[PDB]
Design a protein around this motif. Sequence first.
Motif, PDB file in Angstrom:
ATOM      1  N   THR A 159      57.590  62.134  33.192  1.00 20.35           N
ATOM      2  CA  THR A 159      58.218  61.352  34.261  1.00 20.35           C
ATOM      3  C   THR A 159      57.665  61.588  35.688  1.00 20.35           C
ATOM      4  O   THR A 159      58.154  60.937  36.611  1.00 20.35           O
ATOM      5  CB  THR A 159      59.757  61.614  34.258  1.00 20.35           C
ATOM      6  N   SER A 213      60.387  55.603  38.996  1.00 14.52           N
ATOM      7  CA  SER A 213      59.790  56.924  38.768  1.00 14.52           C
ATOM      8  C   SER A 213      60.595  58.077  39.376  1.00 14.52           C
ATOM      9  O   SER A 213      60.265  59.234  39.136  1.00 14.52           O
ATOM     10  CB  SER A 213      58.386  56.996  39.339  1.00 14.52           C
ATOM     11  N   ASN A 216      63.658  60.727  36.396  1.00 21.36           N
ATOM     12  CA  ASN A 216      63.447  61.565  35.204  1.00 21.36           C
ATOM     13  C   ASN A 216      63.714  60.748  33.918  1.00 21.36           C
ATOM     14  O   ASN A 216      64.116  61.317  32.906  1.00 21.36           O
ATOM     15  CB  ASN A 216      64.309  62.862  35.199  1.00 21.36           C
ATOM     16  N   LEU A 218      61.631  57.247  33.377  1.00 20.76           N
ATOM     17  CA  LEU A 218      60.465  56.403  33.101  1.00 20.76           C
ATOM     18  C   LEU A 218      59.227  57.188  32.704  1.00 20.76           C
ATOM     19  O   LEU A 218      58.864  58.151  33.379  1.00 20.76           O
ATOM     20  CB  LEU A 218      60.149  55.575  34.374  1.00 20.76           C
ATOM     21  N   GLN A 219      58.529  56.729  31.665  1.00 23.39           N
ATOM     22  CA  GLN A 219      57.228  57.289  31.309  1.00 23.39           C
ATOM     23  C   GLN A 219      56.232  56.683  32.305  1.00 23.39           C
ATOM     24  O   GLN A 219      56.006  55.486  32.276  1.00 23.39           O
ATOM     25  CB  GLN A 219      56.808  56.991  29.878  1.00 23.39           C
ATOM     26  N   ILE A 220      55.783  57.457  33.276  1.00 28.16           N
ATOM     27  CA  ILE A 220      54.946  56.920  34.357  1.00 28.16           C
ATOM     28  C   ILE A 220      53.610  56.368  33.832  1.00 28.16           C
ATOM     29  O   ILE A 220      53.143  55.393  34.388  1.00 28.16           O
ATOM     30  CB  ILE A 220      54.735  57.908  35.544  1.00 28.16           C
ATOM     31  N   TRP A 225      60.561  53.137  29.497  1.00 30.84           N
ATOM     32  CA  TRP A 225      61.571  54.183  29.560  1.00 30.84           C
ATOM     33  C   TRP A 225      61.311  55.192  28.452  1.00 30.84           C
ATOM     34  O   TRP A 225      60.983  54.795  27.331  1.00 30.84           O
ATOM     35  CB  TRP A 225      62.988  53.619  29.419  1.00 30.84           C
ATOM     36  N   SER A 226      61.395  56.494  28.775  1.00 27.46           N
ATOM     37  CA  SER A 226      61.243  57.541  27.765  1.00 27.46           C
ATOM     38  C   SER A 226      62.495  57.543  26.904  1.00 27.46           C
ATOM     39  O   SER A 226      63.577  57.758  27.445  1.00 27.46           O
ATOM     40  CB  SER A 226      61.040  58.910  28.416  1.00 27.46           C
ATOM     41  N   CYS A 229      64.320  60.903  27.152  1.00 26.90           N
ATOM     42  CA  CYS A 229      65.022  61.145  28.411  1.00 26.90           C
ATOM     43  C   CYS A 229      66.286  60.326  28.469  1.00 26.90           C
ATOM     44  O   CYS A 229      67.306  60.820  28.949  1.00 26.90           O
ATOM     45  CB  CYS A 229      64.118  60.846  29.606  1.00 26.90           C
TER      46      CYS A 229
END
Length: 528
Positions: A159, A213, A216, A218-220, A225-226, A229
């Motif tokens: 993230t 972003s 904690n 989003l998969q940057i 979205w992760s 997470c």
Amino acid sequence: APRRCCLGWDFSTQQVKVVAVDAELNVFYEESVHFDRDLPEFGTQGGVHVHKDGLTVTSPVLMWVQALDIILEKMKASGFDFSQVLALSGAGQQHGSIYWKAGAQQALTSLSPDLRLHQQLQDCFSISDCPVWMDSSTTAQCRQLEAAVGGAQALSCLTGSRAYERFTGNQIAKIYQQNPEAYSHTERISLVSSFAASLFLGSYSPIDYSDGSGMNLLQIQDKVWSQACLGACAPHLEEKLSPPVPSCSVVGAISSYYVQRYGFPPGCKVVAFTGDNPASLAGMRLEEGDIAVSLGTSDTLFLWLQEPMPALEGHIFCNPVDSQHYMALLCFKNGSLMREKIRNESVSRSWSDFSKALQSTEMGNGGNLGFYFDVMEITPEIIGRHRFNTENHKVAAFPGDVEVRALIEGQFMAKRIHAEGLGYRVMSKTKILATGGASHNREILQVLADVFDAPVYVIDTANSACVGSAYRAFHGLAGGTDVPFSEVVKLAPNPRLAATPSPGASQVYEALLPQYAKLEQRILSQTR
Ligand SMILES: O=C(CO)[C@@H](O)[C@H](O)CO
């Protein structure tokens, strides 16, 4: 020529601000609504409520909605010509979140121009008091999130940041844990930025990659979205957020509400809102290889990053003006108060005598190095004053002029070392932008130019998030993702060159930066 414009909004902690920027990229109008002063019934102080625990910091969502009514009516009363607005965008104070009650989108999509927003959206929020960036009450959720995804470093790689108390996912997890009934009754969760964008659309705006972003979540890298997470924060969270979008996205046309009530043209475009720091990066017109130093109570470093290296310090976000690349924030707690204390202790109580100390000392300070942390520092985690002489021996004190240079050289070498730790590299094209109180001091900016071996420019950033937002709106009109942001904003006012590195600076700091970095590690290993 009829004057066409874009509006640049800022939904800040203490106020709602707006600027109107014309097609030549000149600001010709500014207005604001100050929360404590203009909406005193909410009982805020600094636009927030600090709760009894001293950690929970919130703002009433309906205060932000009502402030938008007040500012639009204040613009209308001043004779502002809304028919000239081609597009608008804005910035939101980062991390803060809005919880929309089930059935609230029907109220957004059925707004009548005869009534105000506050009146019509008064029962649309499942949470009245929104957590804001100043909240530090979610340490247990931070540790739970990190443990759930494999640790602090694992969360940062994913993230761009380890878990921080103000980051939205940790706040969402606390609301779910402490108020699971209100969470189950939440159909949509917005950031302040996307909440403000939703008000102008009269429908829910998606979250952009850049402000997205700061959660904690989003998969940057993948811009998705992760799932790990999301699941570690709160259930059914993905449907409440919706898919994130590139920051340069037309999220829709302005609502007919604004067309009919204020006279916006029906074709006015709403460009996705972003975070205030990402919007200031746009406002300052950073490009690949550039860095911005905001000097104040806290010193903030803004970096452009092609390829990021997420760490246990700093924050890596998706870039707002280039969705394929990144940006970073590094925050330094010991800023202007240290510079003032050192001035008052070591020279006369004036910035002129501080500058003379820098003029009367050589680059590298004869090998004298200093770390000045009267309050616990964030980047890195060190406290205390640590002074070393040219033989790397620890010393109790320096002469007054040596002290002034040890502070300023040290502070700028630390910024370079910590930026480089996130993947930043000085390039031939590199420009340094310096803003804040200390950017008015030529001798301080000379040290900055010498340490980075790059030219330093000075810029006024009082409205950088507003102005950056209006630039981003223009970028959406001038072609969006088909054209580079930098080519669109070429017409904007240029910053003034304040300093260029002195001859021999490269040789001095190439040898001294690694010695400063080694002493920092030595102090850190004595802490553990
Ligand atoms: O929390 C942060 C950045 O991480 C603040 O700069 C707010 O964005 C200010 O509104």
